[PDB]
Design a protein around this ligand. Structure first.
Ligand code: 73L
Length: 501
């Protein structure tokens, strides 16, 4: 009568044996594979720090080439000198950060950091922060040359490359990003990293949004956890760029199974499934600044995702980022202006043979539409199909070894996407990639019923991916191409076109 889900029961949805982990031309591995053991902290490979200061690698703060005019001085030595002081007041942390960021002393606002420490936290919580958490963060950040001994390659445009690193290595790099130590990543007029996302956390410290203390509580929850007890797993970051896209009009593949619900979440009810991150082209969006929607929330509760911003170049139309192994450290309530940190989370996910949590997330960026009717243009529809297809396709893996896709309203709200069209686009891309779909409508029960009714209508009539794509081309041609102001909606159009043919 008032069903919370529709279609295939979620228990019938798919939730393989891994080859030996080793470095290769397309795979950077920063730990000792021969010494990888369950419950043991991974050993870095190589044993001693090796540096690369070039256009193809991350510029490390501990590099001997990280210099500053004084006679060129060592910025790493200045970083150590600045951070190894007693912090008793928020001004001390501000002053420390600015000693090696002198050019931004008038541009960087620290209001949110000062208000969190002085006006949000109770006396005992502020004391625990500066007596235990901040000194423990400084120590793991300053351990960077002994932890991250191998150069980290940039996951540049058109590269099909993977990075497997430890959760411990990520914690050292993230503590550095908090203390804003990454060089060449700050200038507004920078050229070298203009197409890369921000990594240093300075924009998290600015202004008076009520959401900043919530972001800070979520990040300090993570930092408290990883400095008290070193995490033992690995995380893989894969940049995927497809060369060959399907000729959608000719696709003879039938639709796959659907589970659609207005209750639940991707991270809780999509366990063991490929989880979609409704990404911005610069991965993580405004996680280190003001943004607090779907992507930023996932990046806060699974902070290991944030390090993708260090080495992931802006995604092109034919690219996506696949992150395997991130751990959930926090629980939350609300969304956007109502987001609140709830408590610490003990991730119960099992680990695979590479010691990675069994959590696979794909970042796929939807297009932003200035006008509503722009999304119905064939080129724009083909773009969204190819994007979702790239995120879902696992070249070399057979259908029976592919889990269902756990997704929802991709590119909705601010980006101007039509939920009914985007749902069809994802259903079609999942069909071409031969995966089943688990779709979350986040409280919209009417959308759940419409997606279900459309999917069951097309399935019963045995319409292929090609048949559905051709119907989308007809809708543009009949109702959008000559439209000046649409007159009829997409789903009624589809039912009419099929039932009257
Ligand atoms: C059962 C519910 N109801 C509401 C209102 C909810 C909050 N919420 C919401 O509002 N939106 C906007 C929206 C879009 N379409 N609609 C209709 C709303 C979401 O996108 C959304 C996404 C997720 S999620 O499962 O992706 N998990 C993360 C946030 C990544 C970690 C969770 C909650 C969300 S969850």
């Amino acid at each position: 009568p008032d069903k919370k889900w529709l279609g295939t029961p979620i228990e019938e949805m798919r939730r393989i044996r891994l080859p030996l982990l080793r470095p290769s031309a397309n795979h950077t591995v920063t730990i000792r594979v021969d010494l990888l053991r369950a419950g043991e902290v991974p050993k870095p490979f190589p044993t001693h720090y090796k540096d690369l200061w070039d256009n193809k690698h991350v510029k490390m703060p501990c590099s001997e080439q990280n210099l500053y005019p004084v006679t060129a001085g060592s910025r790493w030595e200045l970083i150590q000198t600045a951070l190894l002081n007693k912090f008793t007041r928020p001004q001390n942390l501000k002053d420390a950060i600015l000693k090696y960021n002198v050019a931004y002393s008038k541009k960087w606002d620290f209001t949110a950091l000062i208000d969190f420490w002085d006006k949000v936290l109770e006396e005992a919580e502020a004391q625990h922060l500066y007596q235990s958490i901040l000194p423990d963060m400084v120590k793991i950040a300053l351990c960077l040359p002994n932890i991250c001994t191998q150069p980290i390659p940039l996951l540049a445009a058109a590269m099909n490359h993977s990075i497997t690193m430890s959760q411990e290595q990520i914690a050292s790099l993230l503590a550095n990003a908090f203390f804003c130590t990454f060089p060449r990543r700050n200038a507004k007029m920078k050229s070298e990293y203009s197409s890369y996302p921000d990594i240093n956390f300075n924009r998290l410290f600015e202004g008076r949004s009520s959401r900043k203390p919530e972001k800070l509580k979520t990040l300090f929850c993570y930092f408290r956890r990883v400095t008290a007890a070193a995490p033992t797993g690995l995380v893989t970051f894969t940049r995927q760029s497809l060369e060959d896209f399907p000729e959608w009009e000719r696709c003879e593949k039938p639709l796959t199974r659907l589970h659609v619900t207005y209750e639940g979440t991707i991270e809780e009810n999509g366990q063991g499934m490929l989880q979609v991150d409704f990404a911005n082209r610069f991965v993580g969006g405004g996680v280190t600044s003001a943004g607090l929607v779907q992507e930023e929330i996932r990046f806060l509760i699974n902070p290991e995702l944030i390090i993708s911003r260090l080495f992931t170049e802006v995604l092109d139309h034919n690219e996506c980022l696949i992150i395997t192994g991130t751990e959930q450290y926090s629980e939350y309530t609300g969304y956007a202006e109502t987001y609140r940190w709830s408590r610490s989370h003990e991730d119960g996910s099992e680990r695979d043979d590479w010691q990675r949590r069994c959590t696979e997330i794909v970042a796929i960026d939807a297009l932003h539409f200035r006008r509503y009717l722009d999304q119905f243009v064939p080129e724009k529809m083909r773009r969204e199909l190819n994007k979702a297809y790239c995120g879902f396709l696992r070249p070399g893996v057979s259908s029976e070894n592919l889990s269902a896709v756990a997704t929802g309203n991709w590119g909705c709200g601010a980006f101007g996407g039509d939920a009914r069209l985007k749902a069809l686009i994802q259903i079609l891309a999942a069909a071409a990639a031969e995966r089943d779909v688990v779709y979350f409508t986040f409280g919209d029960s009417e959308l759940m019923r419409d997606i279900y009714s459309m999917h069951i209508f097309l399935t019963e009539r045995k319409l292929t991916v090609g048949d559905v794509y051709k119907l989308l081309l007809r809708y543009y041609n009949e109702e959008c191409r000559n439209c000046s102001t649409p007159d009829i909606k997409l789903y009624p159009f589809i039912y009419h076109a099929v039932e009257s043919c």
